[PDB]
């Protein structure tokens, strides 16, 4: 996720 808590995705 995020970042934080990257993306989805990247």
Same mark, same amino acid.
């Given at each position: %996720?995020? =970042? +934080?808590? %990257?993306? =989805? +995705?990247?």
């Amino acid at each position: %996720t995020x =970042p +934080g808590a %990257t993306x =989805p +995705g990247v």
